[PDB]
Amino acid sequence: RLNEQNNESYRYLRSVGNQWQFNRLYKRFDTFDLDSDGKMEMDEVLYWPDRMRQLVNATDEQVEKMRDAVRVFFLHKGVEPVNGLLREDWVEANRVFAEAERERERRGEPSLIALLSNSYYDVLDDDGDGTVDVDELKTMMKAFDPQEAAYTFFEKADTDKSGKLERTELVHLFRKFWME
Ligand SMILES: [Mg+2]
Ligand SMILES: [Mg+2]
Numbered sequence: 750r751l752n753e754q755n756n757e758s759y760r761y762l763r764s765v766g767n768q769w770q771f772n773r774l775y776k777r778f779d780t781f782d783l784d785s786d787g788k789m790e791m792d793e794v795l796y797w798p799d800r801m802r803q804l805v806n807a808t809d810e811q812v813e814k815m816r817d818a819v820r821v822f823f824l825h826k827g828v829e830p831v832n833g834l835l836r837e838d839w840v841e842a843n844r845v846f847a848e849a850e851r852e853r854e855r856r857g858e859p860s861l862i863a864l865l866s867n868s869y870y871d872v873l874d875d876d877g878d879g880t881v882d883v884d885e886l887k888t889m890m891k892a893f894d895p896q897e898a899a900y901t902f903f904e905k906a907d908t909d910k911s912g913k914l915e916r917t918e919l920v921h922l923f924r925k926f927w928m929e
């Protein structure tokens with residue numbers, strides 16, 4: 750069972766008075782239980798920024814900003830600080846987070862997906878031109894475990910055909926991906 754006591758998204762919804770109730774997906778979980786112990790843990794998810802950090806390019810501040818966004822993001826996705834997130838609570842945790850994000854949009858509050866995206870944006874672009882290119886996106890894939898395949902994400906996200914992903918466009922990429 751998931752509720753305001755063991756899940757941050759229910760904590761968020763009830764803090765603002767939203768009474769929402771929960772009544773492929775698992776493959777994503779299995780990609781994220783690195784040790785396959787069927788629990789996702791904060792040390793485990795915090796591995797992903799550690800990999801990204803080794804592949805670039807980036808300042809301590811930029812890396813820490815990303816580390817923090819990843820931590821906030823997975824916490825709200827249900828990964829509790831010490832207790833983690835069991836495979837059996839994964840599906841719910843996902844849907845409650847989707848509601849929390851819709852509620853944040855309704856209240857004009859910052860998307861946690863957007864926070865995560867913007868944090869990665871500053872780490873993915875570190876020739877410091879100030880935009881992300883398709884080679885830079887390749888690095889993102891390799892960090893989240895396949896480089897060619899970023900050509901697919903990329904074409905979908907550069908709706909101006911500029912040849913570079915700009916902040917807005919990356920937010921759209923991450924955003925669409927969790928929900929569709
Ligand atoms: Mg695990
Ligand atoms: Mg760049």
Ligand SMILES: [Mg+2]
Nearest residue numbers: 907911913915
């Ligand atoms: Mg563009």
